[model samples]
Target: WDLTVKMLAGNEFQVSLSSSMSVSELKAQITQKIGVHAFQQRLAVHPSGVALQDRVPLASQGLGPGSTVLLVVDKSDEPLSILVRNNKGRSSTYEVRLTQTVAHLKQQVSGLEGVQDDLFWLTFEGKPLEDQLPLGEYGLKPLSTVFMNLRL
Candidate 1:
């Protein structure tokens, strides 16, 4: 499904995200191309300007060939940096916020790792971060370094 994408940076390019690819995955590609944060980008399938959401498969969302994908920008939902590390391999940092629950971070980790949410967990100093707790409760201002456990 080849389509044209329009963005604020005078970006106009051909994009054909394969079927079964998630929407957030495509957003990250645009982020890589346009130097915009993925969270800041809002995609609209043109003509009727319908909005797109994250974590949805790209297979068949009513888009057709030669379609127009417009990139709209939005702000807010405050962003913060949190470092997540596997006990062995490497660490990754994500943009999260104080108001959001641990679920948000957990959700992002699942998506990024391309794994089910239930297969992994995060902890800080041996204490598992509860999903319902706000990120602010963790009380670390120096960019959180939450430990991760992926039960493969």
Candidate 2:
């Protein structure tokens, strides 16, 4: 399939990404040519502010050949506001929020240096949260300060 993407240079680039690519892999390939980091780029569906994870497949978004994906490449050194708890019993900021989902949180948590095998639980107002719950359904606002406790 043909994909027409605009590089960081504002120059439109056309290339073929096989139908077999997931959102993450397609992005990695794009970043390789654009000279940007996949982790540093942001993606949002056009006409909507919905965010997407890299592992999500293009087909899941209903994208097709010759479709356009608008992306914002991060060049700043600004810190992303994410919390990480390691197996060492230390909690720190991981990265900023790019998209909104429990699955996205899982991705962030999994990428941390430690806490690879810990069973984590998230709570909202003393209630348990499931990874399958949509962010909006729980009245949890993005970028809000909330309480989280971790155990290994």
Evaluate all candidate structures by whole-model CA lDDT and list the values in order.
0.72, 0.58
Name the candidate that leads on lDDT. 1
lDDT of 2: 0.58
What is candidate 2's lDDT per residue for 125-149, written digit by digit as tens? Answer: 6776566544433444334433344
lDDT of 1 at 82: 76
For every candidate in turn, the CA RMSD to the true structure comes to: 11.0, 9.1
Task: Please write out the lDDT profile of model 1 over residues 1-152, one tens digit for every residue.
Answer: 57678875576877666656567667757766765655567788776778875554554665666777788765455677878886575778888776677888888988887767788888987888888766765754556689888776
What TM-score, over all chains together, does every model reach?
0.46, 0.45
Off by over 4 Å in 1: 74-152
